[PDB]
Symmetry: C2
């Protein structure tokens, strides 16, 4: 009845690198010691959380509020969190909150076309144009457009390559082009965007054609 219990428990959240994120935890009739774990690692029991320079427990003691405040968010924060309270002095039972997953989003590097600024093609001599978006979490989507902003979906092969950290991804989109004679000095552009991006980013290449 009077045993310590949660008024609020953390829920899954998603946040971009550099952002602030606060995982809620509030206790009614708090009796034991409160602590957050991160992937089952105890973060510590004092509000300043020494050892973790970007973490602190904020809120007032009177309200039982020990929310885990993270700023700035970094990729290393992508993990499972839990709010815990140890048993009370009279044996009031320990309590453990719902686990809360923090998903951290990472904007990719600027998209780049491997072939550079200009490609010198020959009519009917098939050629590859590769757009690359390095290190996004999640992988960036890539759209191709022609000289007039018409989206292409033909002759395009999109692939994803995980980075060694197994969290970030490099996205690649290959446009296989059969250079028509009219294609001379036309442009092709790729547009890359992941869910961390505020809008898409673009790269462009000019195509020259002989014959």
């Amino acid at each position: 009845y009077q045993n310590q219990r949660f008024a609020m428990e953390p829920q899954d959240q998603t946040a971009v690198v550099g952002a602030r994120v606060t995982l809620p935890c509030r206790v009614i009739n708090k009796q034991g010691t409160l602590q957050w774990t991160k992937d089952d690692f105890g973060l510590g029991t004092s509000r300043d959380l020494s050892g973790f320079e970007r973490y602190a427990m904020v809120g007032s003691d009177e309200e039982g509020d020990y929310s885990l405040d993270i700023y700035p968010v970094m990729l290393d924060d992508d993990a499972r969190y839990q709010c815990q309270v140890s048993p009370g002095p009279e044996g009031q039972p320990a309590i453990r909150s719902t686990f809360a997953g923090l998903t951290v989003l990472v904007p990719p590097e600027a998209p780049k076309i491997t072939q550079g600024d200009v490609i010198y093609a020959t009519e009917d001599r098939k050629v590859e144009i590769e757009c690359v978006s390095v290190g996004g979490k999640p992988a960036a989507e890539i759209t191709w457009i022609d000289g007039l902003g018409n989206v292409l979906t033909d002759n395009i092969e999109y692939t994803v390559i995980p980075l060694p950290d197994q969290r970030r991804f490099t996205a690649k989109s290959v446009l296989r082009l059969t250079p028509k004679k009219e294609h001379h000095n036309t442009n092709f552009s790729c547009q890359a965007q992941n869910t961390a991006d505020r809008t898409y980013r673009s790269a462009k290449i000019r195509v020259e054609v002989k014959y």
Copy 2:
């Protein structure tokens, strides 16, 4: 220079009421040390308030923060890890290997369900049941005749989990065909689990008609 372990805790087995100590020693300790029990943080002060039977023993000088438990209870059966947080200069955290503590529980005294005596009739098939309640693990049960011979035939040994899904009740049934010779003879069961210091016995006398 990284903080690292000099000693990590290993799996141990202990009987309820015993003292058990899980080693953890740190070299170049920079961060704060803490134990977890089934991923619950036990606290970062040596007296571990909130856990009346736990404390971290050893000297700071030796980097020793072994988890001391006394008296051991069934609730201690769990997986433990020794953790040290990042240091002031960014020395990375360390986590020990996990150590499982297996707690053993002696069963209650064995009992024969038919009790003190069986008044039987010749060739009228009868069953004698020995029961050992509440052992972790389940007690093994051996049947012996009046001469002290282990009976290995006509025996059904079963194990039933208890409500807490940790302790077990062991039962062993001996199928007997009453014979004139079996008059006023004795049957004993001997029950023992790994927690027991020795076996415990119950005895039944059988009369034939």
